[PDB]
Amino acid sequence: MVDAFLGTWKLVDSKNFDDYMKSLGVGFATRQVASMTKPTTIIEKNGDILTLKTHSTFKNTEISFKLGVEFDETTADDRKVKSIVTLDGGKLVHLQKWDGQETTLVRELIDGKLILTLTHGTAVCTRTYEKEA
Numbered sequence: 049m050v051d052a053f054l055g056t057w058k059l060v061d062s063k064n065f066d067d068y069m070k071s072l073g074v075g076f077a078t079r080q081v082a083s084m085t086k087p088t089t090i091i092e093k094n095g096d097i098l099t100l101k102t103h104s105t106f107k108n109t110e111i112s113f114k115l116g117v118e119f120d121e122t123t124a125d126d127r128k129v130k131s132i133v134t135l136d137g138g139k140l141v142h143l144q145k146w147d148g149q150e151t152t153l154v155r156e157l158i159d160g161k162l163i164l165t166l167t168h169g170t171a172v173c174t175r176t177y178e179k180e181a
């Protein structure tokens with residue numbers, strides 16, 4: 049169930065995040081700070097509304113959405129985007145569209161860990177989170 053995603057997750061591994069951030073035009077000073085943060089992802093539900101928070105020493109984000117229903121998102125870097133989150137093959141797929149561009153944030157559970165794959169053009173970043181109590 050989507051319920052297996054719920055809770056508090058701490059970053060334990062990251063691959064190619066700098067490439068992903070460069071692909072979105074994130075400036076070098078922000079990429080430097082973000083390369084060292086170890087954010088917390090919190091996923092909560094109330095009926096069919098999910099809330100996904102990310103917390104770090106650099107930045108906070110939060111979105112709420114109904115699965116399979118489009119929402120407007122102002123991203124952390126002030127992209128004004130059209131978004132949707134869905135379950136697809138048991139993975140939580142978050143698609144953002146703006147200016148004919150797309151990025152996907154795909155979350156899945158493997159051996160109790162949460163694996164986030166971030167794709168924008170050719171850039172693919174894999175980030176691994178472990179559950180907190």
Ligand SMILES: C[C@@H](C(=O)O)c1ccc(-c2ccccc2)c(F)c1
Pocket residue numbers: 059069072074087089102123124125164166175
């Ligand atoms: C989910 C969280 C994380 O990976 O821990 C996160 C936070 C912000 C971003 C982000 C947001 C705006 C531009 C570039 C990257 C991200 F890709 C992932």
Ligand SMILES: C[C@@H](C(=O)O)c1ccc(-c2ccccc2)c(F)c1
Pocket residue numbers: 069074078079081082085086087102103104105106107108124125
């Ligand atoms: C990964 C996460 C974090 O460190 O908390 C994060 C959050 C915000 C950003 C971001 C990205 C571009 C502009 C402003 C902020 C990021 F690159 C990474």
